[PDB]
Write a protein that binds this ligand. Structure first.
Ligand SMILES: [Mg+2]
Ligand SMILES: [Mg+2]
Ligand SMILES: [Mg+2]
Ligand SMILES: [Mg+2]
Lengths: 80, 90, 80
RNA sequence: AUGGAGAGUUUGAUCCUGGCUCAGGAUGAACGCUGGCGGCGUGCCUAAUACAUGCAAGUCGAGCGAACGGACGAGAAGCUUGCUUCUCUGAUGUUAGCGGCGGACGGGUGAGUAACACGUGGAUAACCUACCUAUAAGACUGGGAUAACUUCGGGAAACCGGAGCUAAUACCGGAUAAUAUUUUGAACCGCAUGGUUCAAAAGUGAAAGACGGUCUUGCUGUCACUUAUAGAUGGAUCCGCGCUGCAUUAGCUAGUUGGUAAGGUAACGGCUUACCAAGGCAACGAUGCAUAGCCGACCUGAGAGGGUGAUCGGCCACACUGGAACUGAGACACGGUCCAGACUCCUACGGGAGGCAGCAGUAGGGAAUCUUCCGCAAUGGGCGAAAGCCUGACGGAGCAACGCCGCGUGAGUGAUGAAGGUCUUCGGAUCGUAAAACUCUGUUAUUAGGGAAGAACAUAUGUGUAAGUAACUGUGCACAUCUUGACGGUACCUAAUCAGAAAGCCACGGCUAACUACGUGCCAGCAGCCGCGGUAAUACGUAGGUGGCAAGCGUUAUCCGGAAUUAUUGGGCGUAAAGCGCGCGUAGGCGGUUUUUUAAGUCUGAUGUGAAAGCCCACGGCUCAACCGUGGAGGGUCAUUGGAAACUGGA
């Protein structure tokens, strides 16, 4: 029933075995001056088969803790 | 233990109790589970009472046990009678 | 010191003695059963049954948690 | 539309720039002078310094044995037939002890913490949960101990040690029983891991009795018990976002980042350990240093914002400092255990006891913050079937103008402008309707009577009625009747007496409401800033008068405002402070015209949530108000979901 958060982002490093780090980009607004400013957050997600490669735009979903800092799992590779 | 009880409000020499569902260990006047009504024992020389029968019955069925005064209040409102009838003829 | 506190000290010591005796017994049985399963022995099934009996009786006495007993039983019976 | 004031000061004079200062609001305030009452609040902000003394956690005899007392009432006559013993029966009770539950709640404090700690919104197909409620199945058959108690021994004590005996709802073996665990077949489903349900085998896991009713060679009511399942409650973990200063802190990290295996935990996971690789974080500020409990809220401001985190509520953390586990559903446990350290006290020197950041109080520090009070009568909590017991939570008294609010210190007529103070042009002017005198009132005060609500109850007793039983007791419910108040004979009401007990503080040069006299003479002194004082000072001191407030009035400290003086709203850089000496250029920022498309930004609905209390609006109750309660309204940069496509972003 209840679904879990899903994010789409580019892969910025895959040197780890079966792990890819996904860079999700957002635009937070300055609380006083109101301007839109870029915000990048790197997500450590599980890559079981090493299918994802550095550069491709992938989709990840939140899971239970899988490692010290891995909390997400790769769902599909939207683009490459 | 879940319980339906009276939490004090008002002022010195002027109490006003609210009827609240609360864990027994929670403080009086502190954390509550859900409020169900009010009980003013100093109004018009006759204790004013308001209660939500649906919530009272739901919590009694779930397992909340009233205190002495709340039991009397529920009897006066007739909630105890309906609860007993429902339990017996379930 | 409070009277009930002193009573609790005494009862705590007694309960600790009993619990540690039983826990040591169950640990010994589990170790013996695991060794027997690792090196096939004609006594294997009887030892595993004794280990399971003591594990569950300890779990019911609350010396170990039910989930701990379940893990012990699972690993023991998968080995055997 | 509900909302926004300025003034002084740079000059011979001016406009501008610019800082400085003042008028406002607020406080857990302190101090000075003064001081009548009532209500509602508030009261160690410093030393998370050390603590004398009293108290702050017990309860259950309807789980258990034993002991105290021993009623009702058994026997001889001491001829004392009213006092006598042990040879009995032995009631209501009580208790040292085992056992159950509680003690992890309630209460205190904010030291630590820059962190998923807190707030908000989600997730757990990675979780645990005693007491409570409901349903299903059971609660069978045996056993050995040990407290208590008796006796000896050792110790100052704390407390131990040996021997003998005795129970249980204490402990243990066995039987039966799983959705629990393994294995083989399935079916359907989701978001990787997987989840759900159906079969067939193997291994294994429980329990208790107590008090009553009955037709009493046997069934049954209440409580208690075991297992399984749900619910409820409580707890745990993960994640998005938000949340503080410093770069005169630029590198940090080696269990570190990932993987495989194992162990471990309720639970996933480098949580831990072996092996393989070299990863991981960081200018979008890592690391380091400094500071800090977070929040609802609170103060201020027209708002945008700025400041704060008392009381009250939520969450977190801690309990002399540090480490550790045991018991337990729950703790690594404020008034529990062990060890180390520092510190108090007892000792027979061998050894022991302890931890107010619980409520009072003491010393100390400080400008500064309460009495070693009454009571469980109300609410709440622990145990018990219940009566009931415990509860410094809590409900209430005492102390403090510390704050807010309410009412007083008299009201009417009173020119006859009395006397007296002050000034004076010596006419008078003013204090002044002020006073006196007359008339009235009793808020308030004094005395005497009446005297609430807060009280629901629980329990007990009669009557019914629902489930189940063959029936009965009991169970729940409904209606009835006696009994329960510390505050306290307090509030409040009634009757009588007296204006009689009850006004002080600052200011009067401008800002800024209020001016004269005398004394002093760049002295004494004042001062927030400009300044005032050297002989005729509205600025010093006193006096009269006046102004602003009033049981308060001033001073000091701190925050916001005024300050557009960090300018998003809402400022600037030729000469007032401010364009790098100038290029080449990376990141970032921004970007020409049209069409199609997307829907991240943007806009518009629905749903959930943003606790209560608080601010605001309305209503209601205290004689009003403060205060209290009720219902609205608002508060997100929040989350899912449906719509729109001009603009920014992507194609
Ligand atoms: Mg601190
Ligand atoms: Mg404790
Ligand atoms: Mg210049
Ligand atoms: Mg130039």
């Amino acid at each position: 029933r209840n679904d879990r958060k899903v994010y789409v982002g580019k892969v910025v490093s895959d040197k780890m075995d079966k792990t890819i780090t996904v860079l999700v980009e957002t635009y937070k607004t300055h609380k006083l001056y109101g301007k839109r400013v870029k915000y990048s957050k790197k997500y450590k997600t599980h890559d079981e088969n090493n299918s994802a490669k550095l550069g491709d735009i992938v989709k990840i979903q939140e899971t239970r803790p899988l490692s010290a800092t891995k909390r997400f799992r790769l769902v599909e590779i939207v683009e490459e | 233990a879940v319980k339906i009880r009276l939490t004090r409000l008002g002022s010195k020499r002027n109490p006003f109790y609210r009827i609240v569902v609360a864990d027994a260990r929670s403080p009086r006047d502190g954390r509550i589970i859900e409020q169900i009504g009010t009980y003013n024992p100093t109004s018009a020389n006759a204790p004013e009472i308001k209660v939500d029968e649906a919530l009272a019955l739901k919590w009694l069925n779930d397992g909340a046990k009233p205190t002495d005064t709340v039991h009397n209040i529920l009897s006066k409102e007739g909630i105890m009678k309906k609860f007993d009838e429902q339990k017996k003829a379930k | 010191n409070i009277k009930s506190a002193i009573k609790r000290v005494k009862t705590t010591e007694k309960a600790e003695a009993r619990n540690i005796s039983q826990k040591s017994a169950m640990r010994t049985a589990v170790k013996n059963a695991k060794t027997a399963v690792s090196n096939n022995a004609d006594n294997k099934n009887e030892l595993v049954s004794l280990a399971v009996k003591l594990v569950d009786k300890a779990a019911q006495s609350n010396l170990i948690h039910s989930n701990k007993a379940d893990r012990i039983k699972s690993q023991l019976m998968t080995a055997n």
